[PDB]
Design a protein around this nucleic acid. Structure first.
Ligand SMILES: [Mg+2]
Ligand SMILES: [Mg+2]
Ligand SMILES: [Mg+2]
Ligand SMILES: [Mg+2]
Ligand SMILES: [Mg+2]
Ligand SMILES: [Mg+2]
Ligand SMILES: [Mg+2]
Ligand SMILES: [Mg+2]
Ligand SMILES: [Mg+2]
Ligand SMILES: [Mg+2]
Ligand SMILES: [Mg+2]
Ligand SMILES: [Mg+2]
Lengths: 127, 36, 65, 188
RNA sequence: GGGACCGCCAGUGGCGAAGGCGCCCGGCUGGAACGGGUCCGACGGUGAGGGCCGAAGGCCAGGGGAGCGAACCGGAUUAGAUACCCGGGUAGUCCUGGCUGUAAAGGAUGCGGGCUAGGUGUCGGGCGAGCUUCGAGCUCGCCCGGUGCCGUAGGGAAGCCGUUAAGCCCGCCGCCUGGGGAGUACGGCCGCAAGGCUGAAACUUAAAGGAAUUGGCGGGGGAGCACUACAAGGGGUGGAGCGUGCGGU
RNA sequence: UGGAGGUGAUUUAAAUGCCAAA
C-alpha cells in the first residue's frame, strides 16, 4: 500500500541531525548529520549543510520504498535552550523537494515542569 | 563588626569586603601568639 | 551545468558590510521551478529587467528591512 | 554486506484493536517476527473515522500478537496534541486540572487527566468545587461502564459534555476536555 | 532504578511581626477584614533591664547523593593569566537532632491617636438597582478595610513627599555631633570553632559628604556626512643611483 | 502624553601617561 515513515530532526546551535525511521520508530532507514557533509566545524549548523544532509537521507529512504514521512522536530530542550536552530526549516523544505510526501508536522521538544538546575552558576556565562 | 555604610562607597579606596577579610586575617595571628 | 536564467522584477535595498550588495526579487524563466519568485543577493550595479544566471535555485536570501 | 542484511527483512501489517474497527494502520519491517512484539504506533482519531474536527486526538496501539504477516494491537493510551491545549490557556482565564486513578467494572487500572477552562479569573474555592464535580462524575462512570465503553465515551466527548453541563452551576465554562488517558494494568 | 524540583494559568495580585510562603486530596491549627440596639466596663500607649523568632553560609553526630559545583586536576587566551571561556571534580546544596545569630535583614522611612481638596485602577465583605443561559453568574452606584498611579494647600537643599505624609498637633523608647586612626588596641561576657555584643587614646588632616547645572568623553543608543574615509577601480611610494630639505656627528 | 516592573539575550585581543605648565 503506502509505506510511511518518520523523520526525526534534531536542531541545535552546533549541529543538525536528520534520522528517518519506519512508522513505529523501531527500525532505522537512514541517518545523516551535518558533520558528514561539510569539512569546517563552523559550517555544521548552517542551512546549506542541512539541505545537503536532508537530500542524502531522502535519496536513501526513497530507494528503499518509503513514500512519505511525518516530521518531528526538536531542539535540545531540557535544561538547555528551547529554541530550534537555523537548520530546521531548510531541512523540512529539502525533504519535500527531493520527492517525499509530507504528512503532519509537529515539534516534540521536551519541556520540564520545573526540572533540574542549568549550568553556569547564578551569574551565567560572562563573555 | 559594626556597620559603616559610608565605607562601602568606592571613590578613592579599595573594596570594603576585602579590607574586612584582611583585618580578620590579621586578628587571627595576634590571637595565636597571645595564647602562647 | 549551465545555470538557469532569472529576471529581476523588483529592487529591495542595499546591504552588506560596505553597502556593496543589493537585494532583489527574481522570477525563474527555465527549469524545474520555472515561474516562482524568490529573493536573492547581487553584487554589482543592477536594474529592473536584467537577467541573472543562477547556478542553483533552492537558496533564498534572508529578508532585510 | 549492508544491503545484504536489508534484504532479510519482511514487512508486517499492523491492525487497530478490535473495538476501534480493526482496520489497517501501517506496515513495519523486521527480519524475525518475535522482534515485532511491544512496538507502539500512534494514529489520529481522524484516520480511524473521517472527520476534520477530531484531528488533534492521538491514540497509541501496542502489538501483542503476530500471526503470519499480520500484527494485532491493544489500546494503551490517548493524548491531545500539544499545540491544541497550548492555544486554550490564556491570560485572564482559569485552568483547572484533575488527575484520577480509577478501576473499571472489569478490573482495569487507568489514570485519567481532565481539564477545564473558565471564562475569567475565579476564586480558589470555586476551583475546588469544580474539581470535586469532575471527580464524582468520573468515579460514577468508571463504576458503571466497562473498559471499551469507557474508552469510547472518553474519546467521543460524552464525559466532557456531562462534566460541562454539571459544572455550569459553579461558573460559566469555555471548554472542558479529557486531556489524557494511560492504562496501568489489566485483569489477570 | 534513583534524587532533587513543582512550568503555562500568574496579576505595582494574596497571606504573614519580620525572615519568608506556589502540584492535588484528607486531618490538626494561628491571625485578620466585613455584618452586629450581643457581652465586659478604661482592662489602654510606649517600653530601660529581660525573653522568643530570625535568608544564605559555617560547625557537631547519623543518613542520602540525580543535577549543579568553592578547593583541585587538565585544555585554551595572553607579554604574563594564580582569572574571565571549555572538559572533569571534593566539600556543600537534600532529610533527622543540636549550635552559631549574621545580610544593600532596604520602604535605606520606630510604634499608637486626632485633623487637613479632588481624580482614577484593583482585592475582600456588605447594601441598592438593572440584566440573566437562573450559575458560588454579569454590569453600574454607595459604605468599610487592604493594595497602586496622577495631583491641590503645606513641607523640603533639591531629587521629590503629598489622607498608605517626608503636612499641623498630643505621647514614649532607641540613636547622631567634621574627615581619618577604627570598628582597631586593652578589659569583660557569650560560643566546640569560625566568630558575635561592648569599645578608646596618641597622632594626622581642610575639607570629607549630598542634590542639581553647563560642557567634554564612552570598547552606550539614534540621525547625517567626507576620495586629506571606506567599498568598486586607475596610477604609484617603500628596494637601486642621484637632486634637495631635516636629525646626528 | 508621560512613567513602573518581568524574561531573554548583548561575535577575538586592546596595558600605560611621560617630558612640560615651574
Ligand atoms: Mg562534526
Ligand atoms: Mg566549570
Ligand atoms: Mg573579554
Ligand atoms: Mg549615612
Ligand atoms: Mg512593649
Ligand atoms: Mg530580603
Ligand atoms: Mg485604600
Ligand atoms: Mg503625589
Ligand atoms: Mg579582646
Ligand atoms: Mg587616509
Ligand atoms: Mg578602497
Ligand atoms: Mg625609494
Amino acid at each position: 500500500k503506502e509505506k510511511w515513515g518518520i523523520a526525526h530532526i534534531y536542531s541545535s546551535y552546533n549541529n543538525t541531525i536528520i534520522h528517518i525511521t519506519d512508522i513505529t520508530g523501531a527500525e532505522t532507514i537512514s541517518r545523516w548529520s551535518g558533520g558528514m557533509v561539510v569539512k569546517a566545524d563552523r559550517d555544521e549548523p548552517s542551512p546549506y549543510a542541512a539541505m545537503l544532509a536532508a537530500r542524502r537521507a531522502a535519496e536513501e529512504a526513497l530507494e528503499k520504498g518509503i513514500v512519505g514521512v511525518h516530521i518531528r522536530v526538536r531542539a535540545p530542550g531540557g535544561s538547555k535552550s528551547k529554541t530550534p536552530g537555523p537548520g530546521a526549516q531548510a531541512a523540512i523544505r529539502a525533504l519535500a523537494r527531493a520527492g517525499l510526501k509530507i504528512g503532519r508536522v509537529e515539534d516534540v521538544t521536551p519541556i520540564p515542569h520545573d526540572g533540574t538546575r542549568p549550568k553556569g552558576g547564578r551569574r551565567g556565562r560572562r563573555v | 563588626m559594626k556597620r559603616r555604610p559610608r565605607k562601602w562607597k568606592k571613590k578613592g579606596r579599595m573594596r570594603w569586603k576585602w579590607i574586612k577579610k584582611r583585618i580578620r586575617r590579621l586578628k587571627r595571628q595576634r590571637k595565636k601568639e597571645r595564647g602562647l | 551545468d549551465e545555470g538557469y536564467p532569472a529576471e529581476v522584477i523588483e529592487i529591495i535595498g542595499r546591504t552588506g558590510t560596505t553597502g556593496d550588495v543589493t537585494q532583489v526579487k527574481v522570477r525563474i524563466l527555465e527549469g524545474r521551478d520555472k515561474g516562482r519568485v524568490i529573493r536573492r543577493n547581487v553584487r554589482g550595479p543592477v536594474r529592473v529587467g536584467d537577467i541573472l544566471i543562477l547556478r542553483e535555485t533552492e537558496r533564498e536570501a534572508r529578508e532585510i528591512k | 554486506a549492508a544491503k545484504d542484511k536489508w534484504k532479510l527483512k519482511q514487512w508486517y501489517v499492523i491492525y487497530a484493536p478490535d473495538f476501534f474497527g480493526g482496520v489497517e494502520v501501517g506496515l513495519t519491517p523486521a527480519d524475525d517476527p518475535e522482534k515485532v512484539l511491544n512496538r507502539v504506533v500512534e494514529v489520529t482519531l481522524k484516520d480511524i473515522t473521517g472527520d476534520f474536527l477530531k484531528g488533534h486526538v492521538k491514540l497509541y496501539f501496542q502489538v501483542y500478537d503476530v500471526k503470519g504477516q499480520n500484527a494485532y494491537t491493544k489500546f494503551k493510551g490517548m493524548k491531545l496534541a500539544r499545540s491544541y491545549i497550548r492555544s486554550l490557556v490564556r491570560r485572564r482565564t482559569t485552568r483547572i486540572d484533575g488527575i484520577f486513578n480509577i478501576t473499571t467494572k472489569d478490573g482495569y487500572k487507568l489514570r485519567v487527566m481532565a481539564m477545564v477552562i473558565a471564562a475569567r479569573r475565579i476564586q480558589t474555592s470555586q476551583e475546588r468545587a469544580i474539581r470535586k464535580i469532575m471527580q464524582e462524575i468520573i468515579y460514577k462512570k468508571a463504576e458503571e461502564l466497562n473498559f471499551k465503553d469507557f474508552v469510547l465515551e472518553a474519546v467521543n466527548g460524552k464525559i466532557a459534555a456531562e462534566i460541562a453541563k454539571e459544572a455550569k452551576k459553579i461558573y460559566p465554562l469555555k471548554k472542558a476536555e479529557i486531556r489524557k488517558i494511560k492504562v496501568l494494568g489489566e485483569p489477570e
